[PDB]
């Protein structure tokens, strides 16, 4: 019963401080496994570490298998992961797929000497720490790399435009410098301009502010065109970083603007009630038709009235999820002013009746 | 769809009951007065700015047809009802307790009738397990 | 009839998903033509690719000609591109000019061996993918490179000021380092300071954070002045990228502030009606003069009243295109408050009459 | 321009009809009451903050001359009327249908008279093609 | 009396212009001590400066000791630093701990020849200038490096996410380039890919736009993957700088939004009065129970009423510290509108009584 | 009369399009003089250009002298630059000082062979183009480099803090790397760590992402500490650019928020009238004392009432120069609500009198 | 905590005095009318939006229990009272003068009674030093 | 400054005329009613939020002394009057025409009296040059 929920929160959805400590320990043991895998790649300790770390690696993979087993067993608490069908649905999740891929890659071959693939197999375990953030996996519209990567998605069109302009400038500039300096050979007897691949490489180097130190024309025309290219194109190349930072600060400012979490309960309840009203509009024999009261031939009228009430509830809920804003202030002032006008009109007509 | 457009046209004419081809706040309020739902002027202006799309503040036959032409099984609606039901489940695992639904539906909202709340309980029950799952209830919601 | 409109939307103004798929395929075939053109520049496949790709290149240029022909033929749907005069007007568009230039460059010479100009001719086809965004070409105030490049235009004065300050600092620092290190020769027996062109080049390298690795004084004074120059001037050099990113995030925030698209219809209709009212003010014999009703000598009065009504409509439309804002809230509160004051005053005077 | 300044000065004096050299909201409202256009106080304050430029809220002869001195064929006005007419054409290619213009001019705006709407149709018609083009209509608009 | 307060403001909490001048002189003498310490590290003046600067360094350390003594003696003005216990509490402050550490490091050994540790000891005095900003040390939630470093803390989660993604990309790209170019040796007979430490180093160089000039594959595949890595990962690496700049500009905009400093006095006074009301609710024999007036058995009622009044005062104070905002405007309009509705209702019922 | 004003606008304060064209031509001739001065520095054309350009340079300096003379003569239109005292005051302006310095530097020596100082003298003419923006010179609080450089001034404290932290990190890291790698010598037989000046230089190189290519330890500990230094300190170093860009976008957003220019006329007029009211409060014999009307002994009362009216006018003017804001909306709502409350109270008491 | 929940439940029932299990603004105002504290409708709505957390605008037993369950010695409250007392001390060193506290407590706030202000002086005095320190007063505040 | 503080204290007492040591909006409005300047409630609240600094909304002797202690020749005031006079000069070169000042001072503001406007003209005249310079007028403003 509740033990399944508690172990599910311990595994996937952290809460409190003990589960946070456990996740912290998981992150550190991931760091430890990655670090000894990467230190196993050195030639001096290639054999000693491989021989010594056999027991640790096998107990680690056994622990990973047991934790996957207990996670899938505890998945039964979630309504989406109930029964064999629910277990299969949980398997289709990207995090579960990645974990299963890691386990099968670990156990591809047994009782064999280690090779470079062993480091690659352990390298896949690096992304396991990021799976804790993506442990929710509620949907695919925005999650972890997509939830906070939506900043790129929000700016996708113009980011694509900027990178396209940068690529066009890079290839064009490479063509110009190649055509101009086909005959230009710098010191040390090396032909700087020998391949358009080299030209594109140096264009990338210049746009990335790398500055290797091998291929630079000493001609004044080349220096001037390179200076113009730097003062024109580097800003567009560096645009996306500041773009995403400014957009992220935008959404951070929007965070404090967000409306209180507990204020959407009446709106959601009204939405559900109107949804059922629409559903029972399909059933003339429902007991809800007697709430208004006889009335017999107005079934379609009641149905469409409930449908427009559901539309109004949808609009109210969509306004609720939006934070407090200038539009909200404007509509609040408008409704208050129209209520005041209606009250003034009714008072005026009442007084006219009284004294007229 | 000829029968559909005909029935919505005749319903629009019935609500108009005046021959000018437009639905007004006064006409709608008179309709609720005849049927007895106690409307509010705020609700009237709120449905006015919602259904009307031409920006003129009145209701027309093309606008009514366009607003009625929308479907009910949109994936956006599916996700919206998902997130609406998520907040009502404190655990958030799709298993919502019976008592919380009971007291919320009773004391919060528009004070829904007890008999129809019990109807909600009996149809939205996973074999009477108490800790019911709303996935099947939403699925039968979207299956019409 | 409608077929011309459908093919025009298929060609220029995309809609739906099939036209989006077609534009995607156009972008990929542009990528393919550019990629085989650039791979044709290699020396190992210079001849084999040229011999093989003759049929593909000729069918591609034939397809481009046919698509240009069908686009100009379908341009007749647009009111600006009707008839021979409309076709000529469509030709004057920058996108049409670029396409015609590309086609004529492709067909300059026939049945001739390929050269480096063939790669240049195919390089012009790279910008064709960007023409899809600029396919509108409604005006020249802001479009594609200018519409989203208005961020630079909005910041043009101060961007020019910053680049001017950077250029002054660069040239001045080059002069100081040359004068100080005229006698400074580093290792490997190379005179670092031999030309002010080299000095300006190294100034550009330092301001661009390139770091080639050839010309650096080993003097302590040179090191200190270079450190001061870096800590003073690099920020101004990198300013424009963050400037444009922050301004773009500004306009993104403004996007959600924008007023609903369908609310401007009554304002536009009133503007048109007032424009015609001004027009008919020029015609005393128009039937609109009888709408008010006799009145004979107030023709100028009616004309100027219609003119001021048109001015009011212009102001209302200009306020409409502006998004919801603090000014809108302030004016709404002001009009509501003055209406309340007028109503209170009329109620007070009515009561004074009633009981006085 | 002596006749122009003289005629605007005498028109300003006629509207003033009081000798203080200023146009007030009360005077303007009395003018509409005499002629019968049913003005609104909101419209009065809206024209006040528009025409007045000195910031004192009243109307002066130099202000009136300056506001009347503007031309009608400004390129900004051309582009503004371009974008205003663009939204009314769903296709956006300059070919606007007859029926859409008809029903919009009838039911939206200030309910323009049917005879003058038909006048609009007959003069703003490209040889009676139905799917008329507004470019020529705007050109004759700006040709005075 | 007041002399202790004046000297405390002279030492720790600057005010006026004379104390600002004194702090400026302190900053310049700190600059002087650091500069002669760093110039003492040169080999030509290692001995001459050490011999000459003995008197200056000893008088400087004596001055530091005397200023610490006078600061701790003047700390008695502060209520937190009264008596021996207050002096000990002042010692536990981080600034006092750093100063004591610097002094003891200076006086570790006497009458001994100088070494490299002397430069290190004087290097600790560099941070003394920053202690002037952190001289307040009111708390540890946000102070100096934390008060303006809260910008990082506000963005901590997503900054950690971005750096984690960058680190994953760096290590993965290093693995790919190593595996691909194990057999790739560039010119000058140097094995570029000889250690994964070198691979990670070059990954850091590429992500930092350093461009040393030693390890770059000349393969076309390597060039393309490096270009993709640059166009994909550099923006995420440069994200935090623009992120913090935009957030700082956000809080700068919030500064002008801040509510007036003198408006919180009534709210604070009401909060204190309600706190005492809660305190005296614990004492039924207090004289405050007679302010309302008998009433005997409503002691719990009065206690809970005072408690809810204290809760209301807490909410009002928490709203006060918040700047003027959309929520404040909305609640002000709501309270005004409800007051108007109540007044209209009472007027209507009064009129109904009058004429009914 | 008006000719002096017209020539003053032609020279200093541009307007229309002809003066803009003249300023554009001035900028281009400045570009021409700088470009031939910089091309005169080459060794191949050092003598030919010097011999040929004598007539052009002398006519250019004559033109500069004549334009300075006509500018100072036309300065008499400005009230600040009237008469000999006004001419002297105009001379003290920084732009006039710079122009006079340039002219005297040009004419230091006559009929002499050119040297490197001639290029330096012509280099000072580069800043003349920037003087057009600073031609106003109304004050020194904010002008050109200070008016748009106020972005730095607004962020001065925290920019200083960030650069101070970066400098501390740089010097500390240089000390650590020197102490760690005193014995580390890389390839080619060069001692990388031979001077703390070299250590500080490489710290600057690393923090500036330069990457020269000479001094890098090959030790794993050095690589790790360099990676940590890069991932920790580069963001703080790059902070100021994004900081200033975001602040500039902030003020750009504030530009559209700015209140209309013509609305401050009544506030300024009221301020002037109240200033004179305060002035005439000093004169009991002024005719303004009879405007209120006898009253004899209330002179001090009238004086202090006029003084508080002037204070109110000052507050109103200070609120006017502020753009439309949340505070403005709040105070407008407050005044409207209090007017409504007063009107309701007076109506209620009037009705109570009527029926009571 | 059984006695605690029982006493808060009975206090809630006593305030309700109607049997519907909810506290309303009318009931609370009647309570103050009975006891005589002259409430304000603004204060009533201000306590309504404060204590109520379900968003329905009424007071329930679970809400009352949750709001009463909070502790008084929270470190956030400690820091808040620190910064609240800081502004009242011009010096800001924790030594607050007697006269400033006297006149502020008298003329500012809700005009607290002189006898209880003197009680504040006598208990919040560091051995009658005049320039008293509020640290000990706050400590005995938080010690209950 | 003993005479200064004494005279401001007695002026404050005279305005109070009630003995409670505070100036209220009712008292100030009664003062203007006695002297006849036709005050406005908006102006009263505007001076209330201006002069009062304690945040309690009333006027106290220390507040009055602090607000009266400010000097008139502040450089901020100099620059503010500079920029205020700049907008009234269209040329912006410090030479302001006679007619513009005349008509602005007459028709804009609070309708200042013609005799005192002529006094302004005669004292703020650079030897009667017509195109007067306001620098000397501001200098004699700030010289008291």
Numbering used by the authors:
A (entry chain G), C (entry chain E), E (entry chain A), F (entry chain C): 104 to 396, 506 to 568
B (entry chain H), D (entry chain F), G (entry chain B), H (entry chain D): 6 to 149
Question: What text does the study give?
Answer:
The KCNQ1 Kv channel, also known as Kv7.1, is the pore-forming subunit of the slow delayed rectifier potassium channel (IKS) that plays an important role in the repolarization phase of cardiac action potentials.
We solved three structures from the polarized dataset: C4-symmetric up and intermediate structures with overall resolutions of 3.4 Å and 6.2 Å, respectively, and a C1-symmetric down structure from a symmetry-expanded particle set with an overall resolution of 6.8 Å. Compared to the up map, the down map shows a dramatic change in the bottom half of S4, near the intracellular surface. At the intracellular surface, the loop connecting S4 to the S4–S5 linker helix becomes lengthened by eight or nine amino acids. The density in the newly formed extended loop suggests that as S4 moves downward, it forms a broken helix ~30° relative to the bilayer normal, and an extended loop. The three helical turn displacement, which would place Q3-R6 below, R2 in, and R1 above the gating charge transfer, more reliably accounts for density, but additional data will be needed to establish this conclusion. Thus, while the voltage sensor is in the down conformation, PIP2 cannot bind to the channel and open the pore.
